[PDB]
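not sure who needs this but someone in the group chat was asking about Proto-oncogene tyrosine-protein kinase receptor Ret from Homo sapiens so here u go. i didnt clean anything up, its just raw.
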Amino acid sequence: GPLSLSVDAFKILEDPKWEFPRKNLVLGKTLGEGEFGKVVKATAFHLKGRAGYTTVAVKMLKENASPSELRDLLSEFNVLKQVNHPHVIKLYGACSQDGPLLLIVEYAKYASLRGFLRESRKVGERALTMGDLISFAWQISQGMQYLAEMKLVHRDLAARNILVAEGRKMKISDFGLSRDVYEEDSYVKRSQGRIPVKWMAIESLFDHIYTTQSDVWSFGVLLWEIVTLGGNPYPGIPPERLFNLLKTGHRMERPDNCSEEMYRLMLQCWKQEPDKRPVFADISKDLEKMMVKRR
């Protein structure tokens, strides 16, 4: 079927640009679990022209992997090979030939944006200002502008899927669910998706339609996570309630320590009509303005 074709494809495609000798890769502690498997800290010897060891992250399949997980791993590989942007995690290579499939990706020193924020506090624990927060959002927005221009939908935008690298540089990560929309500017799925309900656009949840504008909706939830320093969206509301809550035009309330400007941006991202929501370029412009207005 579709997966057996890809697995075979992936084993035969020589790809000397990506393939990396398993002998030169040394795996360490688990950094955690993502959408389709395990992420471990690792070190790679003579990776892509760099003399010596480079510390990296390696994604691999968890025990008892399903076809869905394998498919997601292969998808993430396929996507990351095509993209290069300072606010997108970098792919370095893969090992396919002599053991389990591994992807070798850039290591982020401060792990997930979510964990980094929750270990922080706002200042008028790490000390972050509203400037810091707007900066983070803007870097993510820039990355998304790029991916949207490549005709990619991420689909799983959330603070747990943003990495914080050296110098607090955001890197969009977890491309296991991302899909090419070059043809029709939409990705549609007959079966139920694997994106957390609370991050999904209303059209995605009801109609299984994914577009750049559904990414824009997830970005607003992400904005909310940032402004709350990694709060849990729709706190206390069970996910199944979202169908009725969204269709009756309810949205999250303005959180504390959040401007009117910032909240207006959130609500714009969550407009029922996808055409009314801003584009990422508009989002970046709105954030830049907030940044300079506050000085």
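also Residues 130-149 form the longest helix (20 residues). if thats useful
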